[PDB]
């Protein structure tokens, strides 16, 4: 993973949104293109629509999925099975 001495990577433009909501009014649909972004504790309780190449995946954010990144929770390939 990225080095800890470096900054925990958020996309600034995404993080601004998260914090701008915990004041004004939570919550809503936060359509993103930042799968790169690490989920920050302040994201807890929200629902971020994550892109997968084609479409935005509605993603609730719980406490036990913090250290991860958005992209994990919006898969990019569809399989279902083979010879079925």
């Amino acid at each position: 993973p990225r080095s800890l001495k470096k900054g925990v990577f958020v996309d600034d433009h995404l993080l601004e949104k998260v914090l701008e909501l915990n004041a004004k009014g939570e919550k809503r649909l936060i359509k993103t293109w930042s799968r790169r972004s690490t989920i920050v504790p302040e994201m807890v309780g929200h629902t971020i629509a994550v892109y997968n190449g084609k479409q935005h995946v509605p993603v609730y954010i719980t406490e036990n999925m913090v250290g991860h990144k958005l992209g994990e929770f919006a898969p990019t390939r569809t399989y279902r099975g083979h010879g079925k």
Binding site: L4, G7, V8, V10, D12, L15, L19, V40, P41, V44, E63, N64, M65, V66, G67
Partner: protein, 69 residues
């Protein structure tokens, strides 16, 4: 009890590695035991051997609070 088919139950000493000695009865006079009810993690209070680890994940993470604002 039937004669000639049963093992003898003699007074017996069970000794553990924690020092605890059990005054009981068995078919072996002395027996040493690696673990007992007096030094076992479940029995002996909330002895969480190492496991406080634990339900830290995920957002005790911090390190730190350094995003621009």
């Amino acid at each position: 009890m039937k004669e000639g088919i049963h093992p003898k139950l003699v007074p017996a000493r069970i000794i553990c590695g924690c020092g605890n000695v059990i005054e009981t009865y068995s078919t072996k006079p002395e027996i040493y035991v690696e673990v007992c009810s007096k030094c076992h993690p479940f029995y002996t209070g909330q002895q969480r051997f190492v496991d406080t680890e634990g339900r830290v994940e995920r957002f005790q993470r911090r390190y730190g609070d350094s995003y621009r604002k």
